[PDB]
């Protein structure tokens, strides 16, 4: 017997019982009557919901191999998304993910470290912010460019100028697609139609945008094919190609030019928007709490000077800064239900039989906003990650990147972008609101399965 739940209506299951505006809050309300493990029917499709640390840990960590499937909805097929890492399953996922973790290690692709690629980008970000000449600024475009250029330097071994036309084109297609993918019509309502696609023009537009990106990625693998130094892989493409060489006597291989294009598209997708949004949010929270910004700056000035770039080594000597970055991710909760999981086999889970391929929804909100681990969890307070002495207090409830076998591939890279972009910004600038700080609102704006910050402007005032 599946876990207990609200009795489904015929055909529509429990769809009339969930506010699709704020799915996270509905899931939380259902946990107060059905407890931490409960079943919802998305039109005869059973979804099991895990709410709370204990259930999420039990599934994602204790039974990690069983809860490592990606949940599949019609959008996976309509947008052709199951051929990289994010939406792939089985052998294809296991192999592309294991290759991807190895290649994304700090020194995973040659002498030039990931850290060096981000440090370079952090310098360019600081230069673009100077060019705003301390005038009112929606930082959305600029903060979106930085993480996107890090992905570019990781994949193609060289970053673009922010004014370069091929870059603005890629950036434009990525943003359109992310904005389309974020509509409840595309991510929820059209998924209720298992066979008929009610938005065929939208899916076409998504697939044209991907094609454009895939075409640029192919132009570059050609350029990498001719200038190939075995004994010197520079980037994700060099490492992927020479993985293909080692796979030449073992076809059919999960490593092909097709799976490189699709993997690259996933890294652009996964690695841009969430980092971008987290940065934009961090600046809003620093605007709203200027004392916090001032203590970060004190750590910056004391531990780092004004004569050198920040570097990751500084983070262990900057507990307050580390607490702030950790409290930004915890407070804003950008992926309140992560991405859906699926069980990879039949599994007994607290005396509930969950059949192979049943969709699992993880409430990361329920962990990040635990009111016992983080007292007053709806408040931004760096003290949630500090002890009485001022040292960094780690939390097992810190899961903005999810947990277990599907944990975000970019966990380490995101951690570096956030630490280095934010320390580089505050080492070179003070932040000025156009509205009085006490007025600005910082509560997440939820639209289905994602949180975004409110609109805001600020001035980057050189130090
Ligand atoms: C603050 C930034 C980020 C956050 C909060 C974040 C969070 C997440 C979460 C919650 C997942 C879903 C894990 C699950 O399936 O349960 C995910 C997946 C993933 N993230 Fe990130 N992510 C971020 C940045 C990045 C970056 C920079 C990359 C760059 C490589 C990346 C690559 C991926 C990939 C490939 C997956 C799919 C992993 C898989 O299905 O096996 N992410 N991320
Ligand atoms: C029919 C194949 C055309 C695909 C396509 N490529 C691009 Cl580029 C455009 C720009 O609109 N488009 C067309 C397009 C037309 C309507 C939508 C749309 C916008 C808002 C609400 C619903 C739709 C929709 N999609 N399918 N039917 N209606 C999206 C893309
Ligand atoms: C020019 C191409 C732009 C990016 C994009 N458009 C399409 Cl369509 C794909 C296939 O999913 N992609 C790649 C894609 C891969 C993973 C995601 C994903 C990663 C982590 C957390 C949430 C997202 C997500 N999925 N859907 N919307 N946002 C988003 C986009
Ligand atoms: K149409």
Residue numbers in the entry: 28 to 490
Task: Quote what the paper states about this structure.
The structure of CYP2C9*8 complexed with losartan clearly illustrates the amino acid change from R to H at position 150 (R150H) located on the surface of the protein. The sidechain of histidine at 150 is oriented towards the solvent and away from other secondary structural elements. On the other hand, the CYP2C9*8-losartan complex showed two molecules of losartan that include binding at the active site and the peripheral site, as observed in the WT complex, but lost one binding site in the access channel. The orientation of losartan in the active site and at the peripheral binding site is similar to that observed in the WT complex. The overall fold was conserved between the two structures with a root mean square deviation (RMSD) of 0.23 Å; however, the structures differed in the occupancy of losartan molecules. Furthermore, the structure of the *8 complex demonstrated the rotation of the H150 sidechain by about ~60° in an alternate conformation compared to the sidechain of R150 in the WT complex. The active site losartan has a biphenyl ring located near the heme, while the tetrazole and the imidazole rings were oriented near the helices away from the heme. Interestingly, the structural overlay of CYP2C9*2, *3, *8 and WT complexes of losartan revealed that the F476 sidechain in the *8 structure rotates ~30° towards the access channel compared to that observed in the WT structure. On the other hand, the average KD for losartan binding to CYP2C9*8 was 8.95 ± 0.97 µM, which was comparable to that yielded previously by the *2 variant (9.0 ± 0.5 µM). Importantly, the orientation of losartan in the active site of CYP2C9*8 is inconsistent with the demonstrated metabolism as the site of hydroxylation of losartan is located further away from the heme iron.
Human cytochrome P450 (CYP) 2C9, a member of the CYP2C subfamily of CYP enzymes, is an important drug metabolizing enzyme and represents as much as ~20% of the total hepatic cytochrome P450 content. It is predominantly responsible for the biotransformation of many prescribed clinical drugs that include anti-coagulant (S)-warfarin, anti-hypertensive losartan, anti-convulsant phenytoin, anti-diabetics tolbutamide and glimepiride, as well as the commonly used analgesic ibuprofen. CYP2C9 is a highly polymorphic enzyme that includes over 60 classified genetic variants, with at least 20 reported to possess altered activity. The CYP2C9*8 genetic variant, predominantly found in individuals of African ancestry with an allele frequency of ~0.06, is a missense variant (449G>A) that is mostly associated with reduced enzyme activity towards various drug substrates.
